[PDB]
Design a protein around this ligand. Structure first.
Ligand SMILES: Cc1cc2nc3c(=O)[nH]c(=O)nc-3n(C[C@H](O)[C@H](O)[C@H](O)COP(=O)(O)O)c2cc1C
Ligand SMILES: Cc1cc2nc3c(=O)[nH]c(=O)nc-3n(C[C@H](O)[C@H](O)[C@H](O)COP(=O)(O)O)c2cc1C
Ligand SMILES: Cc1cc2nc3c(=O)[nH]c(=O)nc-3n(C[C@H](O)[C@H](O)[C@H](O)COP(=O)(O)O)c2cc1C
Ligand SMILES: Cc1cc2nc3c(=O)[nH]c(=O)nc-3n(C[C@H](O)[C@H](O)[C@H](O)COP(=O)(O)O)c2cc1C
Ligand SMILES: [F-]
Ligand SMILES: [F-]
Ligand SMILES: [F-]
Ligand SMILES: [F-]
Lengths: 354, 354, 354, 354
């Protein structure tokens, strides 16, 4: 593979149609899904020349750990959908690459098992109807050695994914939510209905600023709010004691018509003015895209779908190859842009084009 | 049906070509028709997170009544063109959904019959060559329980619809203007001529500000001016005593090259500064589009063509399904955007994209 | 015919390929040709409502005569290329429609014959290597009753039209420059060479501000400079005593990459501040386009290619039908936009869209 | 040939696939390659009229020599890839046309042989791992009569060209770096690897501002820094004693996502404020494009790929024809825009369009 696009092709070949659709799709007309890509394509970097490149390093320090790249694996539920080794394959590859891996509330292998892989993992939290269950997950994650809580704040319920509805998508019997008894709703086949959306509408409670404070009081770990797009919500996240935010429209899967995170990133970085880490996701598909995000001010990016393409295509080895490719592309882009460090990349200027 | 687009497909299947064209088409090169869609597609919402969503309500109060959604059925003439039950089917579904229905001057079932369905209806007025006839329609509408007069101000005569001209479109014998003897002109088949345009050029008189005052003096009902695009005309509408305006280019069917209402809406909302209700129409095709209109400042939207798609596809039941779908999409979009009420949605910010 | 586009289709059917190409084409990559259309398509009108339309008039006064529309037939050389009656057919139709007709220096019927048709014609001037010949043409035009001199200032030589070069285009033996002995160069067939471009490079001299003064001193008629795009050249035209200018890139046939006139029009109208008439051409293809040009501040437009489509399709009758269609579309657009006069249309606002 | 596009067609016919790809391609997704063209297409010239054109001259003085056009042949490595006469054919044609030719560090014929052709050549420098070798090349170039050193500053290593990787591109045995023993790395065939990229990663050292000073101290010739895009790097180039810069993203072959030079040119010209020559390259494909670059403030342009198309198509004669065509297109564009000199063209204004 010489690009991430090679991997999407490989994944489409192997995965069952309804599973590829569940992975690829967005909500509504998929306007926000497409806009994530369009928004990146419009950004051009103004590279610097003639700088010392004798020791280019792509490393960052974030949430108390050194990471090999300004990148982490995004939370993606139910990874056994894509390969039998699911989360274990991805976590092993991430560990070996020095990249943080985000363990999901709806992981198909238990959070303790995935944490046991090592690699100083993060944990993604959904707020559940039973608050105590969500707080218990936080404590389990901390006890297991997770280093940050990524609280997803953009899913009071799941968006309307028309591909999943048309397919009457449901989880196969062999894929379950391993962290708790989530019941059978996500496995029920109903015509024109997404079982996964039906399941979560029952299981999830809308999170509020009060929920954030409950989590912050329950752990010493940095709390990172994922799904922030409004400048005022980014400011409030800092005031609330968040250690970071992920500027994100959830891959175009939640509100159709939500602005891409990449379009809000610069304004958000200015408003928080170093008060927390500011990550971004949505459509990152190359090292050059990582560079663009960094130049707009991101601390790091998350990558979601491409990691699943790699997992579907070739399991752990596939994810390894994807991360090695991304690492090479990041080093390449940084050097060509005159940046010996990620901090230097954050000081690059950009220009919008057509 | 999982989207309004499903309904257009269904309607194209069933309707005769020239009737689908009469419904779908616009004037001239259809630039304004396309621009209504383009304009919405360029608007992105900046959603808010972490707000209380324990009682999301899509209701509004408008013209003295509670409506279930910030939406009404737009005036569409001659609904028997699309289904034998015509206006009665649509009005029944609107009533059951709690959505205002606009009864047309050129309805194919009498305004009194449609009003008898219930649901607190509005009445759309065209200014006719005989002024007394137009004022009599206003009084009939009020006597029948209509709750607002929607005075269409953008049709001094009908625009040039090339599809209708090429088709030599005329009304079938079984469709007539039930509110008065409109003569036979709209039924006459002439090559390269639209009988409907020929008919109205004879029957309609251009309305003026004097006509608005005559209507305002003739009724206690709120007068709503439909087809306002200039900021100064919106201001003047308030000064003239209008209870509302509909910012609209008449679905791209009148002046080809007229700006979309959605492009003028924000400026108009600022200029009237709460002095009347400001509605918008043109290309609303989802709950997310309703959200965009609200975020730009609209009090409510009108929906035209999709209601006729639903009527053509499955009669009253079709319209019911369309309104249930729109209601779900509106609730979904509002919640995902952090809005427990339509007032909160009006306070959302937006960003233009490409 | 219900649109001008109908006529282009008709003309492509009948004309020989190389003649249609000579008519349709532009210079270079045809960027400016396409941009003339793109530029109009991006302009949207903000129409006014509720104004008195009891006597809509499309008439203007220009260069001392009343014209039926804010439009004239653009100068187009060698009209016998398109129909045997050539300029006489077009001039007769223009006269009957009350539209000024521009007689060309390179007309294929003598200027005196075309003037004898009546209709108070204009005369287009090219500056020739022998200055006395150009001034003699001016005097002939004035003696024959022409009412303005349209001095083309954007053809120091002909642009590079790749269609004409590839076709090895040359005039047929039966088409000649009837106003003087122009020699045989335009009739010579040479591979990969445009004989018309070769001919004019020999015959034409670049015009200068001194040439303008020589013309202004030679006639009492208003001198109109055609092909102005720079604001400073428009100002200078007023200072030089021009009665008008035509803001124009010569239909995309001269400098490839020249800005469309419609893009410079507003700025030019502001800069001249009523000091001369400001016309525009390039891509006017409907009454709505006329309205857009007027709203941007034009006194009138010229129309070129569509008049030749009509002439090729059906001779004098074809041109008559085209002008009747344009007249109807102009009246329609004006009324729908709330304008009872062309002066009111000039006060309309516009908005750029995508 | 009537346009440069004719030549690309001819070249695609004759060249082996992997060689055409090596020539045509860019790095990554080829975003910057495409953007070079898009950026030029968006620029429109505002031409002037009525100026004296009795002696239009396309000549410039640059680096102490008169050039026939505001254009030079860009450095393109390994010209024997495209025709057996390689650099000698191109240099002879450039000499005969009065256009500077840039001899490459990686020329496939020795720099002394190419210089012996005459025509007052420039020399392009890459900084090599052995600094002394690079400085020796500078001295060789000066001794051989080269008139400027074009120091390429945007290749600390070669970008990721996916076409070359997929093709497993390597130089044929009959093409070598004639200026020094470059070893065998560029000739080694490895699957999924570009031998040329592998070769240069070993051979090249990243250049720094210290390298620029070492070169400036080693020669009396003007040093021109090629690959500057940041305004601050252009300013620093002047402060460093550069005689010129080439504003360039290396034809979209280095950082994918680098802004086009044409997008930075105006800002760069303003910032240097006459302190050095400012050239631009990337996508120049006509005399009209030369005019656009000049109007944005460039001293001259470089042309790369089209010169190789011409060389592949017809050797020395092909390059001659290309330069004659470009010369004619430049003269044509300048005159149509009212410019009797390149200095006048630099004073033209431009407007962005869509
Ligand atoms: C199949 C799938 C499952 C996901 N599951 C979660 C989840 O459980 N929690 C969460 O916060 N985000 C989830 N996401 C969103 C991603 O974390 C990420 O925001 C999104 O995929 C956009 O990045 P991308 O374009 O790189 O895919 C999921 C995305 C996909 C495609
Ligand atoms: C078939 C048809 C008939 C219409 N009849 C009327 C009418 O009688 N009065 C009126 O004010 N608008 C009329 N309209 C315009 C609509 O009320 C509305 O402004 C327009 O359809 C744009 O909304 P849409 O894109 O949702 O269709 C009609 C529209 C259509 C398509
Ligand atoms: C075939 C042809 C011949 C023309 N001949 C002349 C001419 O002799 N003098 C002149 O000033 N313009 C001439 N023009 C330019 C037109 O007057 C006008 O500026 C141009 O066609 C743009 O308008 P359009 O898009 O309506 O065609 C010619 C254009 C065409 C297509
Ligand atoms: C095949 C090829 C080889 C090149 N070799 C060099 C080189 O050795 N040194 C250099 O500075 N630029 C090199 N370039 C870049 C060109 O000098 C120029 O910047 C680029 O081709 C953009 O111009 P264009 O669009 O006219 O091709 C090369 C470009 C190509 C296509
Ligand atoms: F999830
Ligand atoms: F109607
Ligand atoms: F001509
Ligand atoms: F190279």
């Amino acid at each position: 593979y010489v690009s991430l696009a090679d991997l999407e092709r490989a994944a489409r070949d192997v995965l069952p149609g309804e599973i590829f659709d569940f992975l690829a799709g967005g909500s509504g007309t998929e306007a926000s899904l497409v806009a994530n890509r369009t928004a990146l394509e419009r950004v051009f970097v103004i590279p610097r020349m003639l700088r010392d490149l004798t020791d280019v390093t792509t490393e960052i320090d974030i949430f108390g750990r050194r990471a090999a790249l300004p990148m982490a694996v995004a939370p993606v539920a139910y990874q056994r959908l894509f390969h039998p080794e699911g989360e274990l394959a991805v976590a092993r590859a991430a560990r070996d690459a020095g990249v943080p891996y985000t363990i999901c509330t709806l992981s198909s292998v238990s959070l303790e098992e995935i944490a046991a892989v090592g690699g100083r993992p993060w944990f993604q939290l959904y707020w559940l109807r039973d608050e105590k269950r969500s707080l218990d997950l936080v404590r389990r994650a901390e006890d297991a050695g997770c280093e940050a809580i990524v609280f997803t704040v953009d899913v009071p319920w799941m968006g309307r994914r028309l591909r999943d509805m048309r397919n009457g998508f449901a989880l196969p019997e062999w894929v379950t939510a391993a962290n708790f008894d989530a019941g059978t709703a996500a496995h029920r086949r109903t015509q024109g209905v997404s079982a996964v959306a039906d399941h979560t509408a029952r299981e999830f409670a809308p999170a509020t600023w009060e929920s954030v404070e409950a989590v912050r009081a329950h752990t010493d770990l940095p709390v990172v709010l994922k799904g922030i797009l409004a400048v005022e919500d980014a400011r409030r996240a800092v005031d609330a004691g968040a250690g970071g935010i992920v500027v994100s429209n959830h891959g175009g899967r939640q509100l159709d018509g939500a602005v891409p995170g990449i379009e809000m990133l610069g304004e958000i970085v200015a408003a928080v003015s170093g008060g927390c880490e500011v990550l971004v996701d949505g459509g990152i598909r190359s090292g050059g895209d990582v560079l663009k995000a960094t130049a707009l001010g991101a601390s790091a990016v998350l990558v979601g779908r491409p990691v699943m393409w790699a997992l579907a295509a070739a399991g752990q080895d596939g994810v390894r190859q994807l991360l090695e490719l991304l690492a090479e592309e990041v080093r390449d882009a940084m050097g060509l842009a005159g940046c010996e460090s990620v901090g230097a990349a954050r000081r690059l200027n950009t220009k919008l084009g057509v």
